[PDB]
């Protein structure tokens with residue numbers, strides 16, 4: 185059920201239970217979301233440029249001066265990425281997995297699945313997790329590229 | 338309590354100072370949880386010094402903004418002032434969660450050293466006590482090894 | 498009150514002036530708590546006079562005064578040579594002990610404290626007077642001996658005026 | 667009519683635990699405690715801002731004045747115990763007011779002691 | 792919930808949201824949960840006074856400490872603590888020690904509500920139905936929510952002061 189895919193089965197040459205799988209599923213979907221955000225997030229300081237601007241703390245009218253895939257810092261936007269880190273925690277402590285009764289359901293705040301286009305279960309739940317797995321490898325592979333093989337593109 | 342995982346063989350119920358004449362049953366598990374947590378930290382701490390000595394320092398940059406090639410940070414005491422406070426904050430945060438995770442409150446499954454690692458879960462071949470006792474015994478050795486190692490790095494001056 | 502933990506072969510049940518002829522079990526409990534506590538203070542005080550005459554702690558008592566442990570006079574002259582903030586902090590700490598950890602519970606044994614071990618070792622046990630009748634008596638007699646001694650040493654300092662060889666001939 | 671400051675749990679337990687009300691205290695113990703408090707406090711108003719506040723001694727004068735105040739209030743308490751004769755501290759089958767008189771006498775003793783202790787602390791420190 | 796019902800309707804963003812995103816309360820007994828609240832309220836009540844004391848001292852009002860040191864102490868409350876004479880600090884500790892002794896041993900709060908250090912439970916109702924009163928649950932929210940904010944606020948003051956001035 186759920187994230188069981190098509191090209192492979194349970195792909196468990198190492199969980200394999202119910203409660204332990206549920207916690208592992210929450211980790212899997214969670215890591216999937218970030219990679220998809222990070223992967224599309226990394227392509228944007230590329231084409232369309234380092235889009236940002238406007239009056240920021242110690243970064244007023246900063247055109248996203250955090251360059252390169254790692255972002256570096258030097259008081260350029262990457263220090264502001266800590267605000268992203270802080271506010272990411274706020275959503276991680278308010279809309280979290282302790283009251284997240286299913287695997288990684290946040291009650292669908294946007295209601296995108298209320299016929300707006302996504303659907304409950306079936307391919308959509310399987311498509312989300314499968315896409316997350318691809319992005320996680322893509323983001324890690326992109327990390328290797330920036331480190332010792334130039335930049336993204 | 339005289340029959341738990343701690344009594345290995347070379348010493349019996351080794352409580353010379355009498356923490357067990359009044360040690361309550363929950364106090365044992367509380368102190369056992371302290372011992373297991375202390376031992377696991379010490380094993381990680383020990384590896385954290387002997388491994389950067391033989392294996393070279395991390396090939397990388399540690400802080401992408403403040404030029405830390407891992408080589409300007411010495412292995413041992415004094416690295417606390419070399420590693421950034423944020424890399425110190427971030428490890429503090431990571432360890433902060435690892436206890437603010439599934440709870441280790443008194444009576445909880447986290448209160449007896451069980452957290453859900455299960456790297457070595459032998460199929461109950463009379464080895465659950467073996468792996469448990471080995472972890473406790475090694476943690477006891479690791480704590481003693483670390484304190485000597487800390488005194489080695491301090492009294493001599495650097496490393497060993 | 499013969500059989501109470503304080504009767505010893507040298508005097509049996511001493512009570513020469515007869516200060517406890519009537520029962521007054523409350524009076525005995527109060528006086529016993531005083532006897533133990535005064536003994537423990539005297540015992541710690543008696544060691545407090547002997548040790549400085551041999552050894553002095555290395556560092557400085559008040560680093561922002563030049564004052565180091567060595568130059569503080571011994572005996573009842575450190576009271577006017579150790580800075581008042583120093584002595585006030587001992588009073589605050591003894592206040593913590595008397596109000597917090599070393600708080601004699603009414604239901605407990607006379608000298609029993611709910612946070613101290615068998616000879617006083619910090620971090621403790623509930624008392625077992627019957628088994629420990631030997632050491633409980635030993636503490637009282639040692640406290641009784643110390644109270645005589647510390648009253649001596651202070652008196653010796655009061656007359657001789659020092660803490661050296663003359664104070665203890 | 668119950669109010670927080672007199673009928674609340676903290677207020678009740680604070681009033682009951684005062685030396686005048688504490689259970690299990692012999693009358694001389696209540697007197698000693700109250701007297702120690704009064705004698706220790708009463709030294710201050712005289713040794714400071716007193717007629718001889720700037721003299722080299724300036725504290726023995728305060729000690730004498732505090733002991734005098736303690737003695738005067740103790741005499742007043744003796745008058746009260748010999749005229750009103752409260753019987754709430756007397757044990758059964760005793761001369762009426764004996765408990766109050768004992769409390770007042772030991773208040774005088776405790777006032778002397780507290781005044782002397784405050785003076786000793788001031789002189790030594 | 793069962794046992795967390797004794798501290799129910801008293802936390803969260805909205806008043807009836809048991810937050811606990813760490814399981815710190817589940818599997819814990821009723822007395823432990825009550826003791827956990829007693830720690831929370833005591834921290835928060837001190838934090839509220841701590842923040843107020845920080846601001847009346849960081850603005851330039853340290854009279855007792857300017858009149859005891861015979862010089863205007865620095866506005867930075869952390870640095871003013873050092874300048875404050877050691878006699879003042881020791882007396883400050885002793886006064887709180889007396890208060891902590893007083894509340895605990897002589898005038899103990901109840902065991903069902905271990906935060907009633909003033910002891911309103913013997914004159915309070917807390918279970919009537921009047922509107923122009925019986926809003927005691929609401930004022931419990933305002934104490935807790937304000938105190939929780941003060942706890943993270945005072946830590947921010949200390950952390951920033953000890954680091955980025």
Ligand code: CLA
Nearest residue numbers: 187188192193194195196199208209211212215317320321
């Ligand atoms: C955060 C990472 C993460 C987590 C927690 C999971 C969790 C899960 N996956 Mg999953 N997956 C991931 C990443 C992850 N996945 C990625 C990136 C891919 C793409 C290759 C996949 C592809 C995948 C498939 C195809 C299937 C699953 C399945 C599952 C479920 C059972 C499998 C299991 O027990 O694995 C347990 C595994 C571990 C405990 C090992 C964790 C990974 C180790 C630590 C490292 C692995 C090597 C890594 C590449 C080296 C990193 C180097 C780095 C240190 C620098 C479980 C919910 C199966 C499923 O749907 O079951 C219902 C299934 O069929 N996954």
Ligand code: CLA
Nearest residue numbers: 341343344348349350351352356368369371372375477480
């Ligand atoms: C954090 C340290 C710690 C803690 C909490 C425990 C806790 C426990 N150990 Mg244990 N142990 C430790 C370290 C520790 N151990 C080390 C390092 C060794 C190796 C020598 C052992 C060897 C050992 C054996 C062989 C056995 C136990 C047993 C036990 C259990 C019952 C005994 C007891 O109450 O000990 C309480 C322990 C303490 C209160 C620690 C106090 C340490 C004092 C304060 C200092 C000791 C000197 C120290 C080295 C000075 C360092 C110098 C430094 C200042 C420079 C209990 C769960 C027994 C057991 O499991 O019974 C069922 C058992 O058989 N332990």
Ligand code: CLA
Nearest residue numbers: 798801802803808809810815827828830831834939942946
């Ligand atoms: C002294 C700290 C303290 C304590 C003991 C409590 C205790 C309690 N809170 Mg609480 N709270 C606090 C501070 C505290 N709070 C602060 C500062 C906030 C603001 C964010 C809140 C916000 C809050 C909400 C919104 C809710 C509670 C609730 C509760 C109750 C359920 C038990 C619980 O959540 O975990 C009790 C145990 C702890 C809180 C452990 C303390 C934290 C541990 C040690 C890790 C934190 C370390 C931290 C990361 C690093 C310190 C620096 C930091 C400032 C960055 C319980 C009575 C719930 C409740 O009763 O509602 C019905 C609830 O819904 N609290």
Ligand SMILES: CC1=C(/C=C/C(C)=C/C=C/C(C)=C/C=C/C=C(C)/C=C/C=C(C)/C=C/C2=C(C)CCCC2(C)C)C(C)(C)CCC1
Nearest residue numbers: 698702703704706707775776778779780781782783784886
């Ligand atoms: C300001 C304040 C307050 C108040 C306070 C008070 C009220 C205090 C008091 C205090 C006091 C009031 C104290 C006292 C003390 C005392 C003492 C500490 C004493 C002692 C004594 C002694 C020790 C003696 C002894 C003796 C005797 C008995 C006799 C013989 C001789 C001799 C000397 C031996 C309040 C809280 C409201 C609030 C705010 C703060």
